């Protein structure tokens, strides 16, 4: 319960952008938008802590956040706290979206589809939802190799040295079934990288990140042989990775796909 809480906050602060970043790809989102007369309405499925609905919001649009997790939805909460007039906070499944056909102008997915096997009732949904002219906004993160890159590999390895190997590029395999389904809705599919940095992260930063399993990738291990491989991973970074408070840069970039009714 407050444990839930503060792995939500953490999950927060682990994925924020930067400021600079944030506003391109609020920018990137709000110009993909196309309401004839309109006040135009974003709808986010798996909206989470809201670390792409703010910069949205913050700049005054309608927004409809939605979210399955109670959790996720109590830090969006405080988070919009003093400017949320315009936002109506939703707890439902994105599988079914209780909203009327042809309702909203917006509807963003930012590192879900990999989190819903029927992803393509999610699709119908936001198909369903969207008004004529309307868009499907979805983006996603993307890093260039670095320690971190080293240390979620070791931590693949122990993970299959304890017996539970785990799942490689699915994030990337259900991107692309997704853009298959959007060429044959007739969505014309456009990509563009928004925006592309370098932020700092310290090795006991990145350590800390997997202990908390705020990656997806480790959520599958039982959590006690998680455990087990974070007793090691620690112990096999204080051993090769040197200081494990200096800062390592950490290349990535933001990807949007507009697809458009
Ligand atoms: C990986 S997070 C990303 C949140 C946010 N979009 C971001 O980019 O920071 C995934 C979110 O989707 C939610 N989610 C997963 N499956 C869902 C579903 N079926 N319906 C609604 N939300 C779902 C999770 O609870 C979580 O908040």
Same mark, same amino acid.
């Given at each position: 319960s407050s444990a839930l809480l503060r792995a939500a906050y953490a999950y927060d602060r682990l994925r924020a952008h930067p400021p600079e970043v944030a506003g391109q790809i609020a920018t990137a989102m709000a110009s993909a938008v196309h309401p004839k007369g309109e006040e135009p309405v974003f709808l986010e499925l798996g909206?989470?802590?809201?670390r792409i609905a703010l910069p949205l919001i913050a700049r005054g649009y309608r927004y409809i956040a939605l979210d399955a997790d109670a959790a996720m939805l109590e830090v969006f909460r405080q988070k919009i706290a003093g400017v949320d007039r315009k936002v109506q906070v939703v707890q439902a499944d994105a599988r079914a979206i209780p909203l009327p056909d042809e309702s909203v102008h917006g509807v963003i997915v930012v590192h879900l589809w990999h989190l819903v096997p029927d992803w393509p009732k999610v699709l119908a949904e936001a198909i369903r939802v969207l008004? /004529? $002219? $309307?868009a499907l906004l979805e983006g996603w993160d993307q890093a260039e190799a670095s320690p971190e890159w080293t240390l979620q590999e070791r931590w693949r390895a122990f993970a299959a040295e304890e017996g539970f190997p785990v799942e490689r590029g699915l994030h990337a395999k259900r991107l692309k079934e997704v853009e298959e389904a959007l060429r044959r809705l007739g969505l014309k599919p456009r990509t563009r990288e928004v925006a592309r940095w370098r932020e700092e992260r310290t090795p006991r930063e990145a350590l800390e990140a997997l202990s908390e399993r705020?990656?997806?990738?480790?959520? $599958?291990? /039982?959590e006690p042989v998680h455990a087990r491989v974070m007793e090691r991973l620690w112990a096999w970074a204080e051993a090769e990775?040197?200081?494990?408070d200096r800062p390592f840069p950490v290349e990535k970039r933001f990807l949007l796909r507009v697809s458009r009714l």
């Open positions: 909206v989470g802590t809201g008004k /004529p $002219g $309307g705020l990656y997806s990738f480790t959520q $599958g291990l /039982p990775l040197g200081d494990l």
